[PDB]
Ligand binder design. Structure first.
Ligand SMILES: *[C@@H]1O[C@H](CO[C@@H]2O[C@@H](C)[C@@H](O)[C@@H](O)[C@@H]2O)[C@@H](O[C@@H]2O[C@H](CO)[C@@H](O[C@@H]3O[C@H](CO[C@H]4O[C@H](CO)[C@@H](O)[C@H](O)[C@@H]4O[C@@H]4O[C@H](CO)[C@@H](O[C@@H]5O[C@H](CO)[C@H](O)[C@H](O)[C@H]5O)[C@H](O)[C@H]4NC(C)=O)[C@@H](O)[C@H](O[C@H]4O[C@H](CO)[C@@H](O)[C@H](O)[C@@H]4O)[C@@H]3O)[C@H](O)[C@H]2NC(C)=O)[C@H](O)[C@H]1NC(C)=O
Ligand SMILES: *[C@@H]1O[C@H](CO[C@@H]2O[C@@H](C)[C@@H](O)[C@@H](O)[C@@H]2O)[C@@H](O[C@@H]2O[C@H](CO)[C@@H](O[C@@H]3O[C@H](CO[C@H]4O[C@H](CO)[C@@H](O)[C@H](O)[C@@H]4O[C@@H]4O[C@H](CO)[C@@H](O[C@@H]5O[C@H](CO)[C@H](O)[C@H](O)[C@H]5O)[C@H](O)[C@H]4NC(C)=O)[C@@H](O)[C@H](O[C@H]4O[C@H](CO)[C@@H](O)[C@H](O)[C@@H]4O)[C@@H]3O)[C@H](O)[C@H]2NC(C)=O)[C@H](O)[C@H]1NC(C)=O
Lengths: 208, 208
């Protein structure tokens, strides 16, 4: 029988009005037999009609894969609406239903703090700048660095970590050339989270 | 039939000579029809005979659980020797063999940096002290906080994060009363890792 995998939007997509959050319903192991696949979509049990389904695509294992994509309204996802994908196929005993929704829990607003390099590390070639984000809930969050109007990619961010008070924290470490910090370039940590005003805050850091 | 799980020593136990590192071989789903389990232990393929096996213990699913514990020599573990557990049971077609050893790879020394709280934060009643540990390999590590020789264990530490040069980093966040910080008490981050001199370093942090 076919199997169904239901995927959520990316957090950043739900937090920025100009992005396009989508829920993706993927069906695999569709037979030659019985290649017809029907999608029904429901939001809080109410059927919706505007999903965009793709033609089936045969895989190297001689089975078909078919994807239906539902664009969601940012505020619907953030308000906890439940998205159900129902998949019908003649080779199935009964239609398969999957339902997905945003992580639950009372939201808590992240506090964001930039931390300059240790004075030990000024003799290293590069320095590490630190963006600590603490006290947030739920754990879905996006953290990004930039400078002079361009993204700075040479960073890594820890997973969210459950703190003692039940909130999450993480740290993002941006590595830059020392000269470039000496220089006095300003670096900025952008944080996107449902519990922030405008779902966005930025903190900047430069040599003092 | 039964399942076997093989667990390494704690990092701290392998790194401090006074402590006692053990490898633990756990057998679950030992049924009453076949309750007798044989453990054969090997170090680099050579059988050793000093493991201690402890009385089988009856779980709430009525099945059993038998545990053998092998004491390891610190330098054997650190030099990459392989520890093999072989579990023999009547119910089992052939004995199950599990092998474990230290995480492989060329060691790299942790760089340890303490970062004071952000000024932003001085308005709460608690402050966050950070201990940034970067550039280390393998990921086995222990990170602890103390003040005046005593454990401060009101802290949380991120998991190791694979960094863009293939080494690891993490942060440990210690939360303390603002008063303790304001009054100048000294706090210390201690790190234990195989690539450190004496497997140990400490870095302290205080207000001017
Ligand atoms: C026949 O072949 C098919 C097709 O496979 C391909 O072709 C074959 C011939 C080989 O060449 C394969 O190597 C090829 O890939 C096989 O189909 C596979 O079946 C698996 C089940 O049997 C299924 O496993 C499940 O995978 C889930 C994760 O899927 C993610 O991540 C993987 C990488 O790990 C990636 O390959 C998948 O495509 C999928 O990727 C995500 O897709 C979603 C939807 O597009 C993305 O979300 C969207 O992203 C956009 C932006 O891009 C936007 O934000 C939207 O808002 C958002 O919705 C998402 O970004 C992608 N992520 C990544 C990282 O890429 C697992 O979660 C799942 O686990 C669950 O179930 C397990 C049991 O099955 C449990 O153990 C577990 O606990 C979980 O509950 C499964 O592991 C494969 O995904 C599926 N492959 C594809 C391509 O569909 C088929 O199996 C095979 N049949 C036979 C008989 O051999
Ligand atoms: C009947 O019941 C038993 C017992 O069930 C428990 O008790 C009952 C009363 C209920 O409460 C249950 O809910 C309880 O679980 C069932 O036994 C279980 O079988 C599972 C297999 O089906 C097995 O899953 C595997 O777990 C591995 C990790 O186990 C860790 O962590 C869990 C907690 O997350 C813990 O339950 C285990 O005890 C074990 O804990 C470690 O123990 C070692 C050994 O002592 C510790 O290491 C030693 O510690 C000492 C100090 O204590 C000292 O430091 C030594 O130096 C050191 O050696 C270690 O500290 C403990 N770690 C932690 C984190 O606690 C997984 O890794 C494994 O995954 C692997 O396989 C997967 C696929 O199978 C893969 O995804 C993956 O990649 C891995 O390869 C499995 O998931 C359960 O552990 C096991 N539970 C116990 C207690 O043994 C039994 O199955 C059930 N029967 C039936 C029919 O259901």
């Amino acid at each position: 029988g076919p199997s169904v995998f239901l995927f959520p939007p990316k957090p950043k997509d739900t937090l920025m009005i100009s992005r396009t959050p989508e829920v993706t319903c993927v069906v695999v192991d569709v037979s030659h037999e019985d290649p017809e696949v029907k999608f029904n979509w429901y939001v809080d049990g109410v059927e919706v009609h505007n999903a965009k389904t793709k033609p089936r695509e045969e895989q190297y294992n001689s089975t078909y894969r078919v994807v239906s994509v539902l664009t969601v309204l940012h505020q619907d996802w953030l308000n906890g609406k439940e998205y159900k994908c129902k998949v019908s196929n003649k080779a199935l005993p009964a239609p398969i239903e999957k339902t997905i929704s945003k992580a639950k829990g009372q939201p808590r607003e992240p506090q964001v703090c930039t931390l300059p390099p240790s004075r030990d590390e000024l003799t290293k070639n590069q320095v590490s700048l630190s963006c600590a984000v603490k006290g947030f809930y739920p754990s879905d969050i996006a953290v990004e660095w930039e400078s002079n109007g361009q993204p700075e990619n040479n960073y890594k961010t820890t997973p969210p970590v459950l703190d003692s008070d039940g909130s999450f924290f993480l740290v993002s470490k941006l590595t830059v050339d020392k000269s470039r910090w000496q220089q006095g370039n300003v670096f900025s940590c952008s944080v996107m989270h449902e519990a922030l005003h405008n779902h966005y805050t930025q903190k900047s850091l430069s040599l003092s």
